[PDB]
Amino acid sequence: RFLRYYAHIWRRQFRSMPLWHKGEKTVKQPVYVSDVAQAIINAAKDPDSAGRIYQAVGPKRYQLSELVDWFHRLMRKDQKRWGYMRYDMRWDPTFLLKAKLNSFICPGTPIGGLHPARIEREAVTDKVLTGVPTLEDLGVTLTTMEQQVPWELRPYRAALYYDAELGEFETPSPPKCIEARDELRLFA
Amino acid sequence: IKASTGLTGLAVSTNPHHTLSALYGKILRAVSKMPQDASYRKYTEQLVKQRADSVAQHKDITALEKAVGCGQVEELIVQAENELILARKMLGWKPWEKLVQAAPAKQWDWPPAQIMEP
Amino acid sequence: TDGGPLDPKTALARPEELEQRNKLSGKITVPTAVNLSPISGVPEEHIRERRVRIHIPPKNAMQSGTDNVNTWQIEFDNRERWENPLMGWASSGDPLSNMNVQFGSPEEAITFCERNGWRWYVDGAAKPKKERVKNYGINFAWNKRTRVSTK
Amino acid sequence: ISGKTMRGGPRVPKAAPYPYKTKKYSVFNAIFDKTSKRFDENSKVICVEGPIAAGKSKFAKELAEELDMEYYPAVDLDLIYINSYGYDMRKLDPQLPPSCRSYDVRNFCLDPSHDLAAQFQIRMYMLRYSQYIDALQHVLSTGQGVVLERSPYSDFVFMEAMFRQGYLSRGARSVYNELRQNTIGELLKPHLVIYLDLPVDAVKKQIKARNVDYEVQSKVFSDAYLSDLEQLYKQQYLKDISTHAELLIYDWTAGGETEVVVEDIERIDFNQFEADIHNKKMLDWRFPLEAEWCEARIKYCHEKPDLMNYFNVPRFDVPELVRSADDGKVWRDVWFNAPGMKYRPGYNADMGDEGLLTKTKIGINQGI
Amino acid sequence: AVQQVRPILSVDREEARKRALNLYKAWYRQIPYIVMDYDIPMTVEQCRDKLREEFVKHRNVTDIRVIDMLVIKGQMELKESVEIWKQKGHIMRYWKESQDPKPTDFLSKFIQGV
Numbered sequence: 045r046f047l048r049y050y051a052h053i054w055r056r057q058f059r060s061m062p063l064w065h066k067g068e069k070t071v072k073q074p075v076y077v078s079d080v081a082q083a084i085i086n087a088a089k090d091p092d093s094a095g096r097i098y099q100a101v102g103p104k105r106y107q108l109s110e111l112v113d114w115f116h117r118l119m120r121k122d123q124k125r126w127g128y129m130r131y132d133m134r135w136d137p138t139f140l141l142k143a144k145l146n147s148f149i150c151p152g153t154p155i156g157g158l159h160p161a162r163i164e165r166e167a168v169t170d171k172v173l174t175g176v177p178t179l180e181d182l183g184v185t186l187t188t189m190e191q192q193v194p195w196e197l198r199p200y201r202a203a204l205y206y207d208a209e210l211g212e213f214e215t216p217s218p219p220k221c222i223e224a225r226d227e228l229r230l231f232a
Numbered sequence: 233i234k235a236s237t238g239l240t241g242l243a244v245s246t247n248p249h250h251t252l253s254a255l256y257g258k259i260l261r262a263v264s265k266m267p268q269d270a271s272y273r274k275y276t277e278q279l280v281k282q283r284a285d286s287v288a289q290h291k292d293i294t295a296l297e298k299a300v301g302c303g304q305v306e307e308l309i310v311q312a313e314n315e316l317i318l319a320r321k322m323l324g325w326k327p328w329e330k331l332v333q334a335a336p337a338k339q340w341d342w343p344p345a346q347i348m349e350p
Numbered sequence: 351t352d353g354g355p356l357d358p359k360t361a362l363a364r365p366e367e368l369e370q371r372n373k374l375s376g377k378i379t380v381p382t383a384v385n386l387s388p389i390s391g392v393p394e395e396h397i398r399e400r401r402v403r404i405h406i407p408p409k410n411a412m413q414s415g416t417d418n419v420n421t422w423q424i425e426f427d428n429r430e431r432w433e434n435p436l437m438g439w440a441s442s443g444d445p446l447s448n449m450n451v452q453f454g455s456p457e458e459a460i461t462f463c464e465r466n467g468w469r470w471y472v473d474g475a476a477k478p479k480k481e482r483v484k485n486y487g488i489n490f491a492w493n494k495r496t497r498v499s500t501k
Numbered sequence: 502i503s504g505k506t507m508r509g510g511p512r513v514p515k516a517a518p519y520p521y522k523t524k525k526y527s528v529f530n531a532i533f534d535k536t537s538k539r540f541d542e543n544s545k546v547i548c549v550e551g552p553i554a555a556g557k558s559k560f561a562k563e564l565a566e567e568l569d570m571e572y573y574p575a576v577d578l579d580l581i582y583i584n585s586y587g588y589d590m591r592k593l594d595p596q597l598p599p600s601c602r603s604y605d606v607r608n609f610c611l612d613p614s615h616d617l618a619a620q621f622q623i624r625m626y627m628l629r630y631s632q633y634i635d636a637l638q639h640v641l642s643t644g645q646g647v648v649l650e651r652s653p654y655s656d657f658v659f660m661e662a663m664f665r666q667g668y669l670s671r672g673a674r675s676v677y678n679e680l681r682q683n684t685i686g687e688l689l690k691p692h693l694v695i696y697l698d699l700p701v702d703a704v705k706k707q708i709k710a711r712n713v714d715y716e717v718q719s720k721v722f723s724d725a726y727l728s729d730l731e732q733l734y735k736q737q738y739l740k741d742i743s744t745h746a747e748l749l750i751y752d753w754t755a756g757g758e759t760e761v762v763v764e765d766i767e768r769i770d771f772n773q774f775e776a777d778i779h780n781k782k783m784l785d786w787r788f789p790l791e792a793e794w795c796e797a798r799i800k801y802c803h804e805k806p807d808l809m810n811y812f813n814v815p816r817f818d819v820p821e822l823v824r825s826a827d828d829g830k831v832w833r834d835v836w837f838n839a840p841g842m843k844y845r846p847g848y849n850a851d852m853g854d855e856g857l858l859t860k861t862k863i864g865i866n867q868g869i
Numbered sequence: 870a871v872q873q874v875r876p877i878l879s880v881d882r883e884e885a886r887k888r889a890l891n892l893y894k895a896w897y898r899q900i901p902y903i904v905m906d907y908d909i910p911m912t913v914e915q916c917r918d919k920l921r922e923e924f925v926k927h928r929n930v931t932d933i934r935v936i937d938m939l940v941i942k943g944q945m946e947l948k949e950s951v952e953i954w955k956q957k958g959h960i961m962r963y964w965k966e967s968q969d970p971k972p973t974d975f976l977s978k979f980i981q982g983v
């Protein structure tokens with residue numbers, strides 16, 4: 045509900061992406077699910093890990109604006125042709141109505157994973173505490189987003205019926221992580 | 233003239249007597265080049281005479297087939313077209329020479345993998 | 351040869367192609383001590399860990415026939431087995447443990463093992479049994495102890 | 502394909518040959534006379550080629566006799582230096598300027614390095630080209646196949662061999678290719694090509710057997726030169742034509758017998774290639790409709806003058822092939838005032854022709 | 870200890886060395902196509918390493934006939950990969966991704982068991 049919640053039709057507004065503060069004040073440390081599963085099992089094989097707290101975070105930190113730009117480059121949904129553009133979610137009240145309507149109408153599960161509870165998850169920036177063990181303590185070797193995400197989004201690519209010749213789509217530029225010092229400035 | 237050969241993709245032959253005569257004539261020339269003691273030269277040279285004369289001896293293809301047996305005249309040609317290829321090819325291999333490769337030890341032994349007591 | 355047309359392929363082939371067509375007929379020399387481990391396709395892990403025991407299969411003590419020990423054999427190491435959790439069968443992850451091949455002499459067996467990169471070690475060939483007298487009359491001896499008290 | 506023994510007798514034409522030497526065959530002639538009605542199993546083109554002095558001529562004559570094929574003697578410069586009335590143009594050369602002096606095979610074997618060699622090689626290509634077209638007219642109008650000694654397709658080998666020995670220059674080779682490219686594409690490739698592979702040492706011996714004055718005395722027929730021709734026939738010509746024409750190779754049918762060769766040809770089948778439409782083998786001669794037959798017949802019977810006007814490719818940066826203006830005037834004077842060159846052939850009264858007052862006719866596919 | 874034998878493809882180690890490099894060319898040219906036409910996680914740089922990693926496996930091979938066979942088999946896979954006869958699963962089979970690492974140190978193996 046993270047790489048699909050941002051690739052779904054509902055999340056957009058005809059081509060757009062309402063992000064809180066354009067996502068520039070949100071910093072996240074997404075972790076590949078397999079690494080998390082490896083952590084759970086490794087914690088299960090070991091008794092030393094009993095009765096302790098573990099934080100499962102990725103190796104790098106990214107601004108939410110930086111990530112979403114990178115997806116839409118991987119998805120070939122670039123602004124130049126496709127028409128992608130980032131609102132500031134505070135400006136448009138239409139979006140909050142969609143979630144409120146969406147939650148009410150659907151009996152089983154919200155469509156596109158969109159509902160006001162999910163919105164608040166997006167806004168809050170990950171706060172990895174210092175001194176609490178991480179999966180590296182459990183021996184897991186974390187996979188970077190660049191390794192995995194480009195293969196996750198292959199079935200969500202736009203204009204996927206093209207049969208492009210080799211080179212007709214240029215490899216997207218990788219995302220730029222946020223340095224620890226930069227987070228201080230980004231948050232004033 | 234046969235209406236049809238009876239075999240798909242095999243056409244009735246015009247002047248089979250000529251076509252056979254040329255082919256047998258060609259074979260004897262290719263065979264002639266082979267050394268006299270070669271057993272292949274002795275057999276085909278003997279054989280092709282037995283086929284060649286029957287081709288000239290008989291003028292009716294139906295009578296020819298009985299005189300030679302060994303299939304229809306169309307097939308007789310098909311056969312003859314081969315020994316040209318064999319005889320020509322075999323002037324290059326020189327099979328009459330001695331055994332090219334002496335057999336290895338136990339290379340034709342059956343059943344295999346038994347201790348042999350000297 | 352004879353008049354009959356020449357083969358276009360060889361007749362028209364450039365002198366260079368005929369030359370390499372010759373040395374590919376070749377008969378070049380190569381050393382006879384070779385290792386076929388790369389092409390045999392065995393996983394590399396097995397080739398490094400598992401020994402091969404050249405041996406004659408042991409005669410069945412409970413029988414007098416022998417024609418089932420007239421070969422040399424190879425059997426791999428006896429890796430682990432374990433009870434199957436569900437039904438309790440014997441289970442193993444040891445494909446080569448199932449294996450067995452027959453040979454005529456240890457020299458061939460070593461030759462085969464070297465050509466495939468296996469590590470081997472030969473059990474001592476049973477020395478030919480010493481001659482035994484096995485006389486019947488001695489069962490009834492005048493002053494010797496060989497006299498049998500039964501019959 | 503069907504020798505006299507196979508047919509048991511002489512060729513029986515399907516219909517009377519069209520008198521292509523005397524009557525033109527334009528579009529309006531094609532309405533009443535159709536082309537396909539005359540084509541037999543023997544309506545094919547055969548090129549009997551080989552190295553220098555391999556007895557091609559003798560083999561062709563015998564071969565063309567068995568298959569009831571028309572035989573076309575190999576072109577020579579006598580076709581340029583002997584007019585119809587028989588006068589020898591070469592006698593006029595003392596008058597002509599040196600650049601326009603007559604040049605022949607004799608001269609090539611004796612002064613191969615002379616600048617007129619480049620001229621001489623292009624003439625041979627032009628002569629073969631015209632002769633080759635004449636064979637096609639005979640094929641298409643009579644239905645009888647033709648036997649040629651050397652087609653224009655194989656002529657570039659001699660030019661290329663001469664270039665390697667350095668007789669020609671870069672420019673002359675460049676000019677030759679443009680002519681060949683400009684012209685070769687308009688011909689129909691032969692059905693069958695026969696080659697007589699005489700080894701290099703053999704031909705050198707064989708040349709001395711003819712005991713032709715200039716050849717034995719000459720230096721051109723060296724190992725290098727004769728070797729170059731062998732490499733060129735087999736690597737460039739034969740490898741290329743075999744994509745279209747059936748190819749038979751013999752050591753020397755000139756020294757061998759032809760009756761065995763005819764029996765080899767008849768074994769070759771020419772219909773298996775017909776099945777696939779786009780099959781390269783014998784593609785040129787695959788006409789779907791009767792219109793296509795007539796079009797090809799019209800082109801060679803009625804539009805040959807066009808075919809022989811493509812040799813006009815202007816190239817003057819090459820100094821060897823250019824003929825100076827002052828020479829041209831002098832050469833024009835001598836050449837066209839010779840006995841029989843005053844007028845078109847068949848009109849020069851001083852050569853004995855008569856009735857010119859009441860004569861109005863001119864030949865078809867004739868000059869001028 | 871030498872014997873006369875029939876060559877496979879080449880007559881000299883230098884020719885064998887020449888053939889092997891061509892196989893490296895064709896693979897190295899082909900990686901960009903394989904990434905596009907197979908739904909697999911691996912990228913060109915990762916794959917181009919896998920090509921280097923494995924050509925190194927057969928580092929100590931000496932016999933020309935063995936090198937010929939490796940190049941015969943090596944070429945066969947490339948045709949089966951230049952074509953897409955090999956499916957998505959087979960290409961990733963070159964990485965053994967499913968198999969997790971088995972520790973090599975004695976103490977870890979002992980504790981883990983045989």
Ligand SMILES: Nc1nc2c(ncn2[C@H]2C[C@H](O)[C@@H](COP(=O)(O)OP(=O)(O)OP(=O)(O)O)O2)c(=O)[nH]1
Nearest residue numbers: 552553554555556557558559575606609625656659
């Ligand atoms: N420079 C040049 N000489 C040619 C060419 N074609 C033929 N010749 C010359 C080479 C020899 O001096 C001489 C050989 O004549 P041929 O090989 O045509 O023999 P010919 O047709 O007279 O009878 P034969 O070949 O024995 O059946 O003509 C050509 O295209 N260029």
